[PDB]
């Protein structure tokens, strides 16, 4: 605002106002599985086992 | 953002196979790990015979 009364007084008046905001959000999720198996041999009782 | 990723192996005979492997290594590792793979047969009172 200004104002300028008979050319001799004058009067300013500045206001600002300034509002920065910031959010972040970040999220992970890792689900990991491994399932190995091996049958290597196949051990079978003789007929004739006494 | 999703990442989904599912390996499967089976092996039948040869080295045990782990993820790293190379399928080189794998044809080159049967030298002693056979497994039989297809079998033809007799019904077994064909074989009580004179
Ligand atoms: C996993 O996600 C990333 C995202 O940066 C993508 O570039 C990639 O292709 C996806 N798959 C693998 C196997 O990395």
Redesign the pocket.
């Known amino acids: 605002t200004e104002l300028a009364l008979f050319s001799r007084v004058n009067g300013k008046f500045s206001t600002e106002f300034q509002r920065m905001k910031t959010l972040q959000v970040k999220d992970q999720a890792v689900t990991t599985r491994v399932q190995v198996r091996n049958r290597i041999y196949t051990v079978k009782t003789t007929p004739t086992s006494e | 953002?999703?990442?989904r990723?599912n390996s499967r192996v089976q092996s039948f005979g040869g080295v045990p196979f782990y993820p790293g492997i190379t399928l080189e290594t794998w044809q080159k590792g049967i030298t002693n790990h056979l497994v039989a793979i297809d079998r033809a047969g007799l019904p077994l009172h064909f074989f009580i015979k004179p």
Do not use: R
């Open positions: 953002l999703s990442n990723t």
